[PDB]
């Protein structure tokens, strides 16, 4: 949809650097050279793919002291980013937040070997959805008969 | 009464406890009485929720809860414009849609008796009995 | 150079300045217990609300001169706002035609395209588009998540670390590969070795837990009294007990009494053992003395701090002490 | 012997012939103990001037928010069912049976009744 | 057989509400102020001040009415029974896909 999209896109205004030792040019494109790829899909169906619009320097990118242009209010500029351990659960989310195939999660539960104590919570919220996709799948059939893939598909 | 009362009464199911002609619907219970599971304590208190529901067009400020003490079985008392109070008998096994049906069904009889004594009656907004409606498709 | 605040995760909510006027406009004019007729939703700019088809029409379907609301809107939204901040209005029309509307921060999809500088059509899920779009890092989502609170009366809860997984997932669903995950290496730093980077996370990532739990437990102690009640876990019951325990409820009763953390009212040997004599006839749990049940038949949803506070025999000494006073 | 010796409580019985089973005409009984019509005058006043009956607004404000309340938290979600009536009384029965503060002001006369025997015994003794 | 198949519906709520009557008449009844008619009249006064004292109950005061609750018990037994049926898909499609592997 067109509405609900930003028209003016402010640019990353670096507030203060996160380091005293300049990351010399030589290594910049030596580590960014590693980021132009990012995995996708988490199982045997692991798919290392490409990322368009790669930023140029990631020592400075987001780790600290850069601004993000979600400028909303009148007196609130592009907020600065505090260091990592200043945000709650970040290196804990790194374990939890990701595309989780249930194939990859139920072997972790039936072996009770969770990398994280919240993957027990990203599991329920994932099954509690798929049950809802059924309790809605059926509270509709109490109206009519809805038949999957019975209408034409494609062009 | 200025004339013999009605004979035939409309017979339809009432979803919501709209103020047909009542003036105050009080619901007395005694929380000293207790019970797990479907009892009369539960059947009358959901009738409070089902009346206070954001769905029923009942004026929420006209329903009065009343915690009693002396082991008063849950009473539901409705008062009509003429002031004649009416307690729907809480037969065991009853629940919300019965009481919302009892008081609303009796609401047409009682509003009829008020219209017999000579009380002028008002226009009612809701028409629980579909009369100006036809099923369309 | 200058780290603004060195604390293990104290940047959770906004600045009290911006959080002062955060809820001055994002407030819910309380539900009048009326019967809603229409729950409309719009995108509207900072204060550029018109009487046109976007707003004035749906009122005019109902005969309301929405030339007024737009002003009552701009009576609250014209100041306070950076230019061109498309807000969401939750107009709610009651059976008396009297509306009540909550203004809300921009949709996080609007936030996400800003924080990455991409216009409409540039972003997409990889399975439709084939490429991860603009990068991000978890450090950024934590600030999109600070202007996105479900309850703008209670900005605190759900917590941040639990609603950032929300904005992260919405991002990934748009192609926004953030760096901390999705990639072989996290954000490279000129500070220290990857090990001297990982050894500084293994402490931080766990210091947060005693921070995150306490905030999860302090919220528990304020939850409705029914939310702290006992709900035994069902992971132990195997799916034939779990089914043979649904035909006759007696088993799911005697279970509850059998595995119930010790309280002043459940220190009845005969009561707790009356159950224990019911299960044995049913061939249910027989080799698990009461203790190893409570540690497995506990409400798993308890924060680990209170997960213990109820654990026998931690609640055995002071058990008979706490009672309904009078 | 009054059944419920509380004389204000009056037992009323009502047996009805209601349509059960769709066609039948069964016998349903609505038994109840309710207050004697004596105790109806001071109650059809809205302040509940009749004691033994408390306007629910007293024990807490806005039952419009206390009974209409629904389960809310991470344990509630959007399947936020109403509260079960069995505790929704308890959180109101426990509020009824709280400590009301017996003040020492009443205790003085009761204390003036505590030293009743010990000192009235020598009164008639020393008054001959 | 009549009084049996209805006992599916009431004895358990009775086996409960006959245990509370025990708990009530044992622990709270002794320390219960019997002058309620004065106590209630005190809150009808505290409400006519508006700044009265409606107090919220606490867990220890409330755990008297702690009971086996088939509202939750019967529910999460199904869900846990179900997230085993949801568990036997990824473990099924892993088994079927494991039948294409040679011996």
The radius of gyration computed from the CA coordinates of chain D, to the nearest angstrom, equals 25
Q: Identify the helix (H) or strand (E) that includes residue B6.
A: none
Mutation site, B89, B90, B94, B105, interface D, largest D CB count within 10 A: B89
Q: Identify the helix (H) or strand (E) that includes residue E26.
A: none
Question: Which residue, chain included where needed, has tokens 């103020």?
Answer: B19
- DSSP conformation class of E27: I
Distance from CA of D48 to the nearest CA of C (A): 25
Q: How many CB atoms lie within 10 A of CB A37?
A: 16
Question: Which residue, chain included where needed, has tokens 């000293």?
Answer: B32
- DSSP conformation class of C14: -
D51 touching chain E per CB within 8 A = yes
State how far the Cα of E17 lies from the Cα of C122, in Å rounded to an integer: 63
Give CA torsion, residues A19, A24, A25, A27, to 10 deg. -90
State how far the Cα of D96 lies from the Cα of E35, in Å rounded to an integer: 12
Mutation site, B18, B48, B49, B54, interface C, largest C CB count within 10 A: B54
Are A122 and C165 in contact by the 8 Å Cβ rule? The answer is: yes
Mutation site, A100, A102, A123, interface E, largest E CB count within 10 A: A102
State how far the Cα of C169 lies from the Cα of C175, in Å rounded to an integer: 10
CA distances from B51 to B23, B84, B108, D67, E76 (A): 14, 21, 18, 11, 30
Rounded to the nearest 10 degrees, the angle between the axes of helix B96-117 and helix B40-52 is 70
E81 touching chain C per CB within 8 A = yes
Q: Do D100 and E38 touch (CB under 8 A)?
A: yes
Give the chain D residue nearest B50 (alpha carbons): D68
Question: Which residue, chain included where needed, has tokens 């994280």?
Answer: A116
CA distances from E69 to C115, C229, C256, C263, D70 (A): 48, 10, 9, 17, 17
Question: Which residue, chain included where needed, has tokens 């029923």?
Answer: B56
Q: What does the H/E/C string look like for chain A?
A: CCCCCCCCCCCCCCCCCCCCCCCCHHHHHHHHHHHCEECCCCCCCCCCEEECCCCCCCCCCCCCCCECCCCCECCCCCCECCCHHHCCCHHHHHHHCCCCCHHHHHHHHCCCCCCCCCHHHHHHHHHHHHHHHHHHHHHHHCCCCCCCCCCCCCC
List all residues 6 or more positions away from C35 whose beta carbon is below 8 Å from its beta carbon.
Answer: B54, B55, B56, B57, C94, C95
Distance from CA of C23 to the nearest CA of D (A): 20
Distance from CA of D32 to the nearest CA of B (A): 6
Are C182 and A40 in contact by the 8 Å Cβ rule? The answer is: yes
- Answer whether the bond into residue C313 is a cis peptide, omega within 30°: yes
Q: Do B52 and C33 touch (CB under 8 A)?
A: yes
Q: Identify the helix (H) or strand (E) that includes residue D97.
A: none
- DSSP conformation class of D30: -
Choose among C75, C99, C102, C107: nearest CA to C90.
C102
Choose the closest CB to C227 out of D73, D84, D97. Answer: D73
Q: Give the residue numbers in E contacting D (CB under 8 Å), as ranges.
A: 28, 32-33, 35-44, 46-47, 52, 54-57, 61-62, 64-65, 67, 69, 71
Give the chain D residue nearest B36 (alpha carbons): D86
E13 touching chain C per CB within 8 A = no
Choose among B100, B118, B132, B136: nearest CA to B19.
B100
Are B27 and B44 in contact by the 8 Å Cβ rule? The answer is: yes
Q: How many CB atoms lie within 10 A of CB B39?
A: 22
CA distances from D44 to A82, B119, C269, C321, D47 (A): 65, 21, 50, 45, 9
Q: How was this structure determined?
A: cryo-EM
List all residues 6 or more positions away from A135 whose beta carbon is below 8 Å from its beta carbon.
Answer: none
Helices (H), chain D: 56-59, 63-66, 85-96, 104-114, 116-126
C274-283 own/partner pairs: CB under 8 Å, 24+ apart: C278/C250, C278/C251, C278/C254, C279/C251, C279/C254, C279/C255, C282/C244, C282/C251
Distance from CA of C94 to the nearest CA of A (A): 26
Distance of CA B136 to the CA centre of its chain: 31
Choose among C217, C194, C238, C228: nearest CA to C304.
C217
- Beta strands B22-29; B63-68: pairing state: parallel
State how far the Cα of C190 lies from the Cα of D32, in Å rounded to an integer: 81
Are C300 and C212 in contact by the 8 Å Cβ rule? The answer is: no
CA atoms within 13 Å, Cβ hemisphere of B25? 26
Q: Considering only residues 7 to 66 of chain E, which have any Cβ-Cβ distance to chain B shorter than 8 Å? A: 9-10, 12-13, 16-17, 20-21, 24, 36-37, 40
Q: Give the residue numbers in B contacting E (CB under 8 Å), as ranges.
A: 34-38, 69
Q: How many CB atoms lie within 10 A of CB C291?
A: 12
- Beta strands D53-55; B63-68: pairing state: antiparallel
Q: Identify the helix (H) or strand (E) that includes residue D48.
A: none
List all residues 6 or more positions away from C2 whose beta carbon is below 8 Å from its beta carbon.
Answer: A16
Distance from CA of E93 to the nearest CA of D (A): 31
Q: Do E94 and A131 touch (CB under 8 A)?
A: no
Q: What is the DSSP string of C58-111?
A: HHHTTT--TTTHHHHHHHHHSSSB-SS--EEEEEEEETTS-EEEEEEPPPHHHH
SS3 call for C255? helix
SS3 call for C130? coil
> Which residues on C lie below 8 Å from E72 (Cβ)?
231
State how far the Cα of C213 lies from the Cα of C217, in Å rounded to an integer: 6
A74-82 own/partner pairs: CB under 8 Å, 24+ apart: A74/C79, A74/C80, A74/C81, A74/C82, A75/C17, A75/C18, A76/C15, A76/C17, A76/C18, A76/C82, A78/A10, A78/A12, A78/A13, A79/C143, A80/A15, A80/A16, A80/C4, A81/C139, A81/C140, A81/C143, A82/C3, A82/C4, A82/C5, A82/C11
> Which residues on C lie below 8 Å from B54 (Cβ)?
31, 33-36
Are A46 and A28 in contact by the 8 Å Cβ rule? The answer is: no
State how far the Cα of E23 lies from the Cα of E28, in Å rounded to an integer: 8
Resolution of the coordinates, Å:
3.9
Q: Which segments of chain B are extended strands (E)?
A: 22-29, 63-68, 75-80, 85-86
Sign of CA dihedral D120, D121, D124, D128: negative
Q: Identify the helix (H) or strand (E) that includes residue C295.
A: none
Q: How far apart are the first and last CA of chain B?
A: 45
C204 touching chain B per CB within 8 A = no
List all residues 6 or more positions away from C195 whose beta carbon is below 8 Å from its beta carbon.
Answer: none
State how far the Cα of B75 lies from the Cα of C299, in Å rounded to an integer: 38
- Contact present, B and A (at least 3 Cβ pairs less than 8 Å): no
CA distances from C298 to C242, C268, D40, D74 (A): 17, 19, 50, 17
- Contact present, E and D (at least 3 Cβ pairs less than 8 Å): yes
Distance from CA of B38 to the nearest CA of E (A): 9
State how far the Cα of C102 lies from the Cα of C243, in Å rounded to an integer: 46
Q: How many CB atoms lie within 10 A of CB C130?
A: 12
Tokens of C20: 């002062």
Distance from CA of A140 to the nearest CA of C (A): 22
Q: Do D83 and C326 touch (CB under 8 A)?
A: no
Choose the closest CB to D32 out of B46, B69, B90. Answer: B90
Give the chain C residue nearest A5 (alpha carbons): C110
Tokens of B81: 């414009």
Distance of CA C114 to the CA centre of its chain: 24
Tokens of A86: 């200043």
Widest pairwise Cα distance in chain A: 68
CA atoms within 13 Å, Cβ hemisphere of C235? 16
Q: What does the H/E/C string look like for B63-85?
A: EEEEEECCCCCCEEEEEECCCCE
State how far the Cα of C111 lies from the Cα of C85, in Å rounded to an integer: 10
Phi, psi at residue A49, to the nearest 5°? -120, -175
Question: Which residue, chain included where needed, has tokens 């020592």?
Answer: A59
SS3 call for B8? coil
Q: Give the residue numbers in E contacting A (CB under 8 Å), as ranges.
A: 79, 82-83, 86-87, 90-91, 93-94
Choose the closest CB to D58 out of E28, E37, E44. Answer: E44
Give the chain D residue nearest B65 (alpha carbons): D56
State how far the Cα of C204 lies from the Cα of C9, in Å rounded to an integer: 9
Choose among D72, E95, E85: nearest CA to A134.
E85
CA distances from C255 to C239, C297, D5, E12, E23 (A): 15, 9, 41, 13, 20
CA atoms within 13 Å, Cβ hemisphere of D95? 23
- Beta strands A37-38; A49-50: pairing state: antiparallel
State how far the Cα of C106 lies from the Cα of C44, in Å rounded to an integer: 9
State how far the Cα of B61 lies from the Cα of C126, in Å rounded to an integer: 55
State how far the Cα of C215 lies from the Cα of C212, in Å rounded to an integer: 5
Give the chain C residue nearest D70 (alpha carbons): C224
State how far the Cα of B63 lies from the Cα of B46, in Å rounded to an integer: 13
SS3 call for D70? strand
Q: Which segments of D19-59 are extended strands (E)?
A: 26-29, 32-35, 53-55
State how far the Cα of C41 lies from the Cα of C231, in Å rounded to an integer: 38
State how far the Cα of A88 lies from the Cα of C159, in Å rounded to an integer: 9
State how far the Cα of E77 lies from the Cα of C244, in Å rounded to an integer: 11
Choose among C203, E78, D53: nearest CA to A131.
E78
Q: How far apart are the first and last CA of chain C?
A: 61
CA distances from E8 to C247, C300, D120, E75, E76 (A): 10, 29, 64, 17, 20
C17 touching chain A per CB within 8 A = yes
Rounded to the nearest 10 degrees, the angle between the axes of helix D116-126 and helix D104-114 is 40
Are C220 and C228 in contact by the 8 Å Cβ rule? The answer is: yes
Distance of CA E50 to the CA centre of its chain: 33
């Amino acid at each position: 949809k067109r509405s609900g999209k930003p028209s003016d896109l402010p640019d990353y205004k670096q507030v203060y650097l996160p380091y005293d030792t300049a990351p010399t040019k030589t290594e910049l494109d030596r580590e960014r050279r590693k980021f132009m790829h990012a995995y996708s899909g988490r199982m045997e169906h692991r798919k290392m793919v490409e990322v368009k619009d790669v930023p140029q320097n990631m020592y400075t990118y987001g780790k600290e002291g850069m601004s993000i242009p979600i400028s909303i209010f009148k007196d609130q500029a592009d907020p600065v980013i505090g260091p990592e351990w200043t945000y709650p659960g970040i290196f804990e989310n790194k374990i939890v937040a990701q595309h989780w195939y249930m194939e990859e999660l139920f072997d972790r539960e039936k072996s009770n070997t969770f990398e994280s104590p919240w993957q027990r919570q990203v599991l329920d919220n994932q099954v509690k959805r798929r049950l809802g996709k059924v309790a809605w799948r059926m509270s509709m059939l109490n109206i009519k008969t809805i038949d999957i893939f019975h209408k034409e598909r494609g062009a | 009464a200025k004339r013999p009362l009605a004979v035939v009464a409309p017979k339809t199911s009432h979803k919501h406890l709209f103020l047909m002609h009542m003036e105050k619907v009080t619901v007395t219970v005694s929380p000293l009485l207790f019970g797990y599971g479907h009892t009369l304590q539960k059947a009358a208190l959901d009738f409070y929720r089902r009346g206070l529901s954001a769905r029923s067009p009942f004026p929420s400020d006209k329903m009065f809860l009343y915690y009693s003490i002396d082991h008063i079985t849950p009473k539901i008392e409705v008062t009509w414009l003429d002031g004649s109070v009416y307690v729907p008998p809480l037969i065991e096994g009853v629940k919300a849609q019965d009481l919302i049906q009892m008081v609303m069904e009796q609401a047409w009889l009682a509003a009829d008796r008020m219209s017999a004594e000579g009380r002028v009656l008002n226009p009612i907004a809701i028409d629980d009995y579909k009369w100006e409606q036809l099923i369309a498709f | 150079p200058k780290t603004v605040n060195i604390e293990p995760g104290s940047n959770r909510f906004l600045d009290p300045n911006v959080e002062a006027k955060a809820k001055d406009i994002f407030a819910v004019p309380e539900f009048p217990n009326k019967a809603v007729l229409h729950n409309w939703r719009f995108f509207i700019k900072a204060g550029k609300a018109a009487t046109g088809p976007p707003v004035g029409q749906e009122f005019s379907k109902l005969g309301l001169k929405a030339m007024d609301f737009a002003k009552a809107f701009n009576d609250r939204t014209k100041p306070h706002f950076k230019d061109d901040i498309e807000l969401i209005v939750r107009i709610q029309v009651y059976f008396d035609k009297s509306y009540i509307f909550r203004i809300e921060p921009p949709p996080t999809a609007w936030f996400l395209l800003r924080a990455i500088r991409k216009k409409r059509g540039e972003t997409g899920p990889v399975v439709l588009r084939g490429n991860y779009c603009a990068y991000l890092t978890l450090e950024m989502c934590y600030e999109i998540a600070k202007m996105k609170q479900m309850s703008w009366g209670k900005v605190e809860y759900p917590p941040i670390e639990v609603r950032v997984r929300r904005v992260v997932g919405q991002a990934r669903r748009m192609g926004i590969a953030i760096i901390g995950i999705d990639t072989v290496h996290s954000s490279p730093v000129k500070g220290m070795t990857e090990k001297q980077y990982l050894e500084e996370s293994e402490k931080h990532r766990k210091v947060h837990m005693i921070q995150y739990e306490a905030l999860k437990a302090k919220e528990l102690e304020s939850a409705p009294l029914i939310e702290r009640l006992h709900r035994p876990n069902m992971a132990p019951l195997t799916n034939t007990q779990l089914e043979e325990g649904l035909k006759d409820a007696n088993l799911l009763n005697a279970l509850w009494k059998s595995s119930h953390p010790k309280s002043l009212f459940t220190q009845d040997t005969r009561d707790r053992e009356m159950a224990r004599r019911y299960l044995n006839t049913r061939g249910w749990f027989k080799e698990m003395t009461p203790e190893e049940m409570r540690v497995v038949f506990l409400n798993y949803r308890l924060p680990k701090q209170e997960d213990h506070q109820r654990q026998l025999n931690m609640t055995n000494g002071q058990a008979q002490s706490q009672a309904y006073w009078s | 012997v009054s059944r419920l010796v509380s004389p204000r409580l009056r037992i009323i019985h009502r047996d009805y012939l209601t349509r059960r089973g769709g066609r039948t005409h069964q016998r349903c009984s609505a038994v109840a103990v309710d207050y004697t019509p004596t105790y109806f005058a001071t109650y059809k006043s809205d302040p509940g001037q009749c004691p033994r009956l408390i306007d629910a607004e007293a024990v807490h404000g806005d039952e419009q928010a206390f009974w209409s309340a629904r389960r809310d938290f991470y344990r509630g979600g959007a399947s936020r069912s109403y509260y079960p009536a069995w505790d929704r009384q308890a959180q109101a029965l426990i509020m009824l049976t709280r400590e009301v503060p017996r003040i020492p002001q009443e205790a003085a006369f009761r204390l003036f009744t505590l030293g009743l025997k010990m000192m009235l015994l020598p009164r008639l003794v020393a008054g001959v | 057989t009549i009084a049996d198949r209805v006992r599916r519906y009431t004895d358990i709520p009775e086996a409960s509400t006959e245990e509370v009557n025990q708990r009530w008449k044992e622990h709270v009844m002794p320390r219960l102020q019997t002058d309620l008619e004065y106590n209630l009249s005190h809150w009808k006064k505290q409400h006519r001040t508006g700044a009265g004292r409606p107090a919220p109950p606490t867990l220890n005061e409330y755990s008297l009415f702690s009971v086996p609750d088939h509202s939750s018990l019967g529910q999460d037994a199904i869900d846990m029974l179900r997230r085993r049926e949801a568990q036997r898909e990824e473990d099924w499609w892993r088994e079927r896909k494991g039948q294409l592997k040679p011996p």
